[PDB]
């Protein structure tokens, strides 16, 4: 099937399905006119008659659409025709972090640290233009052929407010809530900081620091900020975590301080990651 732009031109071309993604279904799409194949979301009007989720999506093409970055997820084009919207972004065909980790179930530190070298990168840059991701979670880190790390799904995310007019309800439903935004104080930068933390940990156990659903059960936990920090961690990535998932957010680390701390700096780290580290742990050193 052939798919119009009616604004313009521009005939491309809709491939493989790519599987369920929210509002979205997605699908390989080539543009016809440079044939790159794009991983696109693909939202019938339908689906968005009702006006704040129409909002939702219009915020994450109006955000996403004006970012640059080798890790963070590229925006190509975005129009609409009579039936359906349509996104077209990066393709990553070597999925997600989240697809990675079920499969492998915990990873070995040079490749930790290789991942979140890039999750980290990506965010500062995010960070540096005020936009705050505010989904940070392993499914939104994709990876590609040449196993490199974009981070994606601005369905999410917003721009950096006034600490007194800012946002105070829970927007969507994060991965990982932290303490201060659920003292309803916001979700502030160190919020994102907080979700590296958790997701670090993941990394490193296979499992989150805190439960991840969201009831009110789980509050005063995330609260007190208190977990288990298990004896099989070396101390450094011990140390980091810490600091990361700190209670008050005023004590959470940079992302300057967090790629300049001990776990980084006194371990190995590859430039190139095979494609085996998807199923297969890798060798010694
Ligand atoms: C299009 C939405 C999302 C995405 O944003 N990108 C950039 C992406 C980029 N590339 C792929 N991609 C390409 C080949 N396989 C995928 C894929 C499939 C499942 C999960 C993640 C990626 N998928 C992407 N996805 C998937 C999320 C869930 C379903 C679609």
Same mark, same amino acid.
């Given at each position: 099937?052939?798919?119009?732009?009616?604004?313009?031109?521009?005939?491309? *071309?809709?491939?493989?399905?790519?599987?369920?993604?929210?509002?979205?279904?997605?699908?390989?799409?080539?543009?016809?006119?440079?044939?790159?194949?794009?991983?696109?979301?693909?939202?019938?009007? !339908?689906?968005? !008659?009702?006006?704040?989720?129409?909002?939702?999506?219009?915020?994450?093409?109006?955000?996403?659409?004006?970012?640059?970055?080798?890790?963070?997820?590229?925006?190509?084009?975005?129009?609409?025709?009579?039936?359906?919207?349509?996104?077209?972004?990066?393709?990553? *065909?070597?999925?997600?972090?989240?697809?990675?980790?079920?499969?492998?179930?915990?990873?070995?530190?040079?490749?930790?640290?290789?991942?979140?070298?890039?999750?980290?990168?990506?965010?500062?840059?995010?960070?540096?233009?005020?936009?705050?991701?505010?989904?940070?979670? &392993?499914?939104?880190?994709?990876?590609?052929?040449?196993?490199?790390?974009?981070?994606?799904?601005?369905?999410?995310?917003?721009?950096?407010?006034?600490?007194?007019?800012?946002?105070?309800?829970?927007?969507?439903?994060?991965?990982?809530?932290?303490?201060?935004?659920?003292?309803?104080?916001?979700?502030?930068?160190? *919020?994102?900081?907080?979700? &590296?933390?958790?997701?670090?940990?993941?990394?490193?156990?296979?499992?989150?620091?805190?439960?991840?659903?969201?009831?009110?059960?789980?509050?005063?936990?995330?609260?007190?900020?208190?977990?288990?920090?298990? !004896?099989?961690?070396?101390?450094?990535?011990?140390?980091?975590?810490?600091?990361?998932?700190?209670?008050?957010?005023?004590?959470?680390? *940079?992302?300057?301080?967090?790629?300049?701390?001990?776990?980084?700096?006194?371990?190995?780290?590859?430039?190139?990651?095979?494609?085996?580290?998807?199923?297969?742990?890798?060798?010694?050193?």
């Amino acid at each position: 099937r052939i798919i119009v732009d009616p604004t313009t031109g521009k005939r491309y *071309s809709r491939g493989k399905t790519l599987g369920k993604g929210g509002f979205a279904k997605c699908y390989e799409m080539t543009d016809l006119t440079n044939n790159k194949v794009y991983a696109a979301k693909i939202i019938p009007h !339908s689906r968005v !008659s009702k006006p704040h989720q129409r909002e939702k999506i219009d915020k994450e093409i109006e955000l996403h659409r004006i970012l640059h970055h080798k890790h963070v997820v590229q925006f190509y084009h975005y129009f609409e025709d009579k039936e359906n919207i349509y996104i077209l972004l990066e393709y990553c *065909s070597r999925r997600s972090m989240a697809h990675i980790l079920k499969a492998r179930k915990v990873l070995t530190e040079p490749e930790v640290r290789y991942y979140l070298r890039q999750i980290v990168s990506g965010l500062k840059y995010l960070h540096e233009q005020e936009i705050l991701h505010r989904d940070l979670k &392993l499914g939104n880190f994709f990876i590609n052929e040449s196993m490199e790390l974009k981070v994606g799904d601005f369905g999410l995310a917003a721009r950096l407010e006034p600490l007194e007019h800012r946002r105070r309800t829970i927007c969507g439903t994060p991965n990982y809530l932290s303490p201060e935004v659920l003292n309803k104080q916001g979700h502030g930068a160190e *919020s994102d900081i907080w979700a &590296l933390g958790c997701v670090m940990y993941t990394m490193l156990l296979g499992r989150p620091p805190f439960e991840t659903t969201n009831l009110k059960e789980t509050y005063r936990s995330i609260r007190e900020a208190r977990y288990t920090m298990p !004896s099989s961690l070396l101390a450094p990535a011990k140390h980091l975590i810490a600091s990361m998932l700190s209670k008050n957010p005023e004590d959470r680390p *940079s992302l300057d301080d967090i790629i300049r701390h001990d776990f980084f700096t006194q371990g190995f780290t590859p430039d190139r990651l095979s494609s085996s580290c998807c199923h297969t742990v890798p060798d010694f050193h």
